[PDB]
Amino acid sequence: VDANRIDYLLNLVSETVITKASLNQSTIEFAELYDKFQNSSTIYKDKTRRLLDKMPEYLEKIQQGYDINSIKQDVLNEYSSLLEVFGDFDSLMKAAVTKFKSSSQNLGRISGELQEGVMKIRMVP
Amino acid sequence: ILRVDANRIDYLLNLVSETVITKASLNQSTIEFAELYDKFQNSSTIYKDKTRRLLDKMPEYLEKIQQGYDINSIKQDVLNEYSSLLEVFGDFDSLMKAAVTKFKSSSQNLGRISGELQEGVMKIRMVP
């Protein structure tokens, strides 16, 4: 066999180990993203329960003549942040998907090269 | 200008086959996470619509109770908005966790295969 053909196979395996390292890093990124979603989900579900449980106190104040605008001020000040409870989940997720897709596609390219290269040595008599 | 063992080349073929299988599984995991991103985006839009509606309704509904509206209808509608909001992402947390678990499994398998490929390809090289 050609010496340079075997050195190409060694270089492809080197590319595989690097791609393996990047894919491992991607598993950690997606585990972190799962944790972030799970935490934000539990937090919003807990906080929205607290909001509903607060409503009778707001009613008591209104019944005593408290300004409804002050109630609105209290509600929005405490609870409007619910809108952002997931933080940067979506942008972090999109970036992690893009990075994972690139590494996975590169692995496909390497594996195709490995397949054809080793298959062509299997064809030498 | 190199000599290689035929049987070791067939062994490397089986390692490359395992690599291709793992790659196909990793590709499906990229699609799974892309689907989950899209699902999060769609459900997050609904989540914000529902949260804005609940926040707007609460002071309005307090005023309506004071104006003499049927209080049960107010309580019921708040609870109905609240349960819709609690369920807006459905089983996303479980689906995301399962997707991470599958990806971790295939990634670890790739690490094992890559170690075997490294030793396998280096040992086919014989002199003269």
From TrEMBL, chain B:
User: Any idea where this protein resides?
Assistant: Cytoplasm
Q: Which residues cross the membrane?
A: none
Signal sequence bounds:
none
What this protein is reported to do is described as:
Involved in the transmission of sensory signals from the chemoreceptors to the flagellar motors. CheA is autophosphorylated; it can transfer its phosphate group to either CheB or CheY.
Which protein, by its recorded name, is this?
A: Chemotaxis protein CheA
- Species whose genome carries this gene: Treponema denticola
* Gene giving rise to this polypeptide: cheA
